[model samples]
Target: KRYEKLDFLGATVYKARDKNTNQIVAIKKIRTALREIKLLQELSHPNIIGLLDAFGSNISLVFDFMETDLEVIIKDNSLVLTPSHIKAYMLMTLQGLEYLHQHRILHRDLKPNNLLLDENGVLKLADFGLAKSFGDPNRAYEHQVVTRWYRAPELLFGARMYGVGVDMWAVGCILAELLLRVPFLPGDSDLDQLTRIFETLGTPTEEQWPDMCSLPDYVTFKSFPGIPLHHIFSAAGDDLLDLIQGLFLFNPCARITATQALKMKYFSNRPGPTPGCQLPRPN
Candidate 1:
């Protein structure tokens, strides 16, 4: 009677109280928690959610409770975020992402909702249902993986062979949303998604992305000179703009890696990332 249903997906989640200790915990019930369990067991990072316990026959896994997600915090207009607050979230996110890449795991889906925050303002990467290891050269992954809004251009063009670059693209989109307090590119469909991306970032040239035309769903589009990054993000400084430009580059090979992003001057500059405890949260 004490367990409160939270949400449902491939699994059902509940805010429950542990019977013996009366401690609050999040319980996820799925058909098979094996895959996520196995993966989380090997991954132990401060920014990555940890698996507390699991019951195989019951198909449930328990995790420490988080107060909210980044999406919810961003949408609350009453909660104004300082640049430092944004930087803090981005740093934690990149740290977690870098760890995943180093371990050869790909977090196929990355968006604001997947980033959970606790009372201390610590952000943890959550939901490993769409994650998988990537060292297998012969493997052909489904291009239709990440959520549409945060999906990368290569994935939109139906590239089965991808890597950390895809997740980096989503990170760029998330960063944009963090600044704008709204989705950067909210497309209605796959075709429209490309149109929105190009219209804002400008249509790519074969010279820019040498293999652009070879993608399975690649097609020509009307020429568009993208609006300048500064124009879109009017309040951002040069350092922030530089980071955004690196993450959103059209050529996947040219995109900045998580490790490189963490080293940028933006992380070390003045008004440094606000400590997690002091960062804002939705009321």
Candidate 2:
């Protein structure tokens, strides 16, 4: 058996020249693969990663190797992202997200690290480890899901039950981070994380969020007027601002859905999103 490695720090993933079926393969447990293989087999979309082959051994998941992700491009100062670039990124992300939600699936761990881009520049959603199927509903799913910075206020409040709104929250944060080239909400603990959210988005009221007080870890905090979006996102357009506001609404009921967001002016009226082939790449 001949295998070649491309990049690695420890041992989660590796690139190999073995099968045309797989330009890259990640070596991991059957336990993890056993869980995601079900979701992967059933999912087929342009923006979603797919499973390649089945061989019962070390349990390597065969997938096409992606060049880089938004995290790589966003954090790379040498690479500049124009309006078109950002539009394309969001477009692809939402497109994939819509597909997931349509199937009644939730990619709970949506973050830059989880998005993978091909050599052609098209982005795809990956890593189904934290994904779940809510085809019916949740018997009070875990509130401690999602990364700290990208976590929704409801999750921060320790809300056991939530919807696709959590994904919308992360989209807004990713958009802001794209514009700012920095982490939007950096908080550690649950209380501090909730506080940071309130500080930036303003304190939610009983009128703002009727469900706020009933969450398991709910608590009152210092009121904050919050900075207006326009003031903070000086470079954002009116349509983009509205899209962000829609994504950031305190009430999950009012939060924008992926399909609805795709219908917004940000996606409609544009310099036009840069085609995947035309997007700038990092070194």
Candidate 3:
């Protein structure tokens, strides 16, 4: 049986058929597969990817195969995304994230590639290699967790002890990318990352985030007046802009929680969430 290569992270992913049942599935081959298997075992939610089986000798993990990912969907200019479509994806992502936070888990990496989508358009959170369980507020975590494009300002400033705020920032980035159809903040380096963020949202002062200077790599930068979210997301409604602003708050302490985000007016307002199967998939 010839297996088709799917994705390449640190692990190798292939689309293959199970010999006995003849069912198509995704097999992830990695030495660190057990960590993901262990985490997936503890997580149970509709919006989170499910692990089907595992083989220790083969060092593989099987999962419910998905046809596409958000990255591809976002990049496809042929498929126009409506407001309801955007809201539907956000709703699913937050619900899954809320469950993880409730269970004290942090998806250190939250990007479009890891958000898998089946033909039905249902998005499920995938990839657990960078995830970790965190409850201790003072525990020092590696600042090098999330990808540079989605990494929060605090993390770039060398924040050691962080929480859901890191993931929230990525969600905000995703929302913006969905609207603009391009990355919200794509920085070349950590310093450049902060510069891009500040230039877009304006630099924060101690008054805004009292603990700003206390971070390991904190540095003073030229003040920027910043561009408004409305001007950037010209096609978005007010409520959608409000949600993005809340998620991208300068102060991590002030960043909106997943549960709170679900209750925002954006979710309940006009153009309700699109049905899962109605969402666009790659041709």
Candidate 4:
């Protein structure tokens, strides 16, 4: 088979190339055929991987492959990832997400695996198989796009038409995971998932979420009353935790956009310099 030489590194669909621009770039491949191709074709952002060319007798695509993924580093290495590293990753992710939304595309599946880092350690959005364009003025988005672990309350609760806010929520989860080195909301299933979200952030009322009540699957979650943001990020400073809280808001509508988050004083002050070209050794 043509794909026989390709490397299936762990969970990633790996590709090999000549190791130079002119040598041909092998973008990470996936199982799905048309959806994956459609996703890469429509998406073009600095942080997102660029699709070079496609050729297939039955099923095959050639993409510009890069270094490993953040998930690989985070999982394999045993170091407490510095706060600065976390912030930098967060910034790039937001940058990528902003670009996607700008082009009217929704990266419905946003997880560590979907993000790849080049040799220089620049993060690139990869794996567009689950990506969907949202320019349909009349039709809304379809559900069952993002991975369950990274799914937002709106997606888990079942919102027919959601936006970039969904990706923002996933960023929130990734943020916490980076700091704690674990999943922030590891719910066993849908019901447990809601409970996990409320457990950490507390349930949100209509006053907090505004339009949350009108969502197709809106249910009056058993209120957990109150829990201060400070408690969640007790280890972090006010500014850093504030940015995280903004992203993790129960109402996707209330969640802060990637641009808004970049401007936050937390990033400007706490993590002074943006990380680059090889992540600092963990711990």
Candidate 5:
């Protein structure tokens, strides 16, 4: 079959059939490089997309096709996301993220759109364009990574060296988006975004973030007492709020890791994550 293009920016994605095996797959026709080609191939998890093969004139990357993504789900007004459904989506997202961390790789971008769902309700992490090795330390690593809404404060402050917490902070944003059914922290500019975060989540003091003043792009701002999570997420349980709070610790070292997050009391509470096969899907 001829390649059918799937919509994306920066690179073209295609839905195609494998001629030899007759298996359907998604193809990324790259005009640029996929740095984690090997990592994508080697990282095996139900929540991670499959890198079936790579070849061609411009190096089309063959991956398991997904029917929809988390962004599409959240945007669908007709579909109501139950608490269990959010848990399931969050569960899959964290599982895949944990796997990446285990391998010492960073899936720097963790927005809703990049989390893809198959027909069976399985969600996988995709679009590794901005990913880098956790070990990739030097004079600098690009702070201009991650979408504006999901970008961590450290990234916005131009922290040259960061760790898994940067990624964790994005997960916190995703959780908030799931709750609010909108991008939690959309910013007009980097500085505007940081102001928004402090304004909403309250300003942090030096005791709260010792490195805040020392970051590469650091600048002072007026102190504001952030609203409690309950103010925004009134329906959210205390445990879930705790989990969200853990994920958003301003200090990169202070933020919870995927392992610690997965073990939080929230996951063990009633209404466990929905199984993949039973997850909600769009018509």
Candidate 6:
């Protein structure tokens, strides 16, 4: 048998067969100068891409490659993805985050683009070069992790220490995105981002987010004033607005937890997706 050329982009990802088991898998190779490979040798989770094997320090990621990412689906597609679809994606994302955080690890960079879906339409987290083990949760974080758009307030303000809340904030952004069918707080810079966040959901006063005044970059943002609950989502049902307000609360501690987010009021409406809702292909 001879190798057949398949169209690909970037580094030319290809499908190769295992001589032993005769299984086809994606072959991802990187030849960058640095050797900061975070091998997923032992890590396993339903929402995480599986590592079939590795090849020395050459850095090869083998998997059943999917054709698209969550970013393209959410940002580009015009499909009417139901609330159930959003919830399913949320569960998968949190499940992956939970696995990493529990193992003393951090995904560092999580975005819609980094999440991949198989042909069967299951979501999984990808990319781990910036990932590092947080052996001691008590210690402060590096302050350089997480994508800017998905970054949490504590992370942006250079908080010495943080936990899963950083990732939870990302979930918050995602939830709003799904709810509004648009990227929430599409700020161009750090300050801009926070401003957008506070615009819709007032700034965190000292009382609301106790440390709001101390966050490294904390500064007065021009107020946008409060938006009435009814005006929050004139298009969507009240249930969604309720859920968004709940998650968009100022305090991080008060921010909806992943477990609690699943039970948000948004899922209670007729148009909402519930357990009985038919699952759609990952979008």
Question: Cα deviation in Å at residue 280, candidate 1?
Answer: 0.8
Task: Tell how far residue 138 is off in model 5, in angstroms.
Answer: 5.9
**lDDT (Cα, 0-100) at 184 in candidate 1:** 99
lDDT per residue (tens digit) for residues 20-108 in model 2:
44356543324556768888887899899876544454676656567788888988989898999999999999999999999988888
| CA shift of 133, model 2, Å | 0.4
Q: Estimate each model's TM-score.
A: 0.92, 0.91, 0.92, 0.85, 0.94, 0.78
Worst window of 10 by summed lDDT in candidate 6? 30-39
Alpha-carbon local distance difference test for all models: 0.87, 0.82, 0.86, 0.72, 0.85, 0.66
| Model 2 pairs in collision | none
Q: Write the per-residue lDDT of candidate 3 for residues 77-162, one digit (tens) a residue.
A: 89999999999999999999999999888888999998999888889999887787786443365334688999988889888878
Q: Which residue runs of candidate 4 sit more than 4 Å off their true CA positions? A: 1-6, 10-12, 18-24, 27-32, 42-44, 137-142, 281-283
For model 4, what is the C-alpha lDDT against the true structure? 0.72
Model 2: runs farther than 4 Å from truth?
Answer: 1-11, 20-30, 54-58, 135-144
Residue range with the least summed lDDT across 10 consecutive positions in model 2: 21-30
The TM-score obtained by model 1 is 0.92
RMSD to native, candidate 4: 3.4
Model 5 regions more than 4 Å off: 1-10, 31-34, 138-144
Prediction 3 TM-score vs. true = 0.92
Model 5, 32-143: lDDT tens digits are 3556586787779998888988876577888898989999989999888888998999888999999989989888888999999999999999988777788776335433
Show pairs that collide, candidate 5: 202-226
| lDDT winner, 3 or 6 | 3
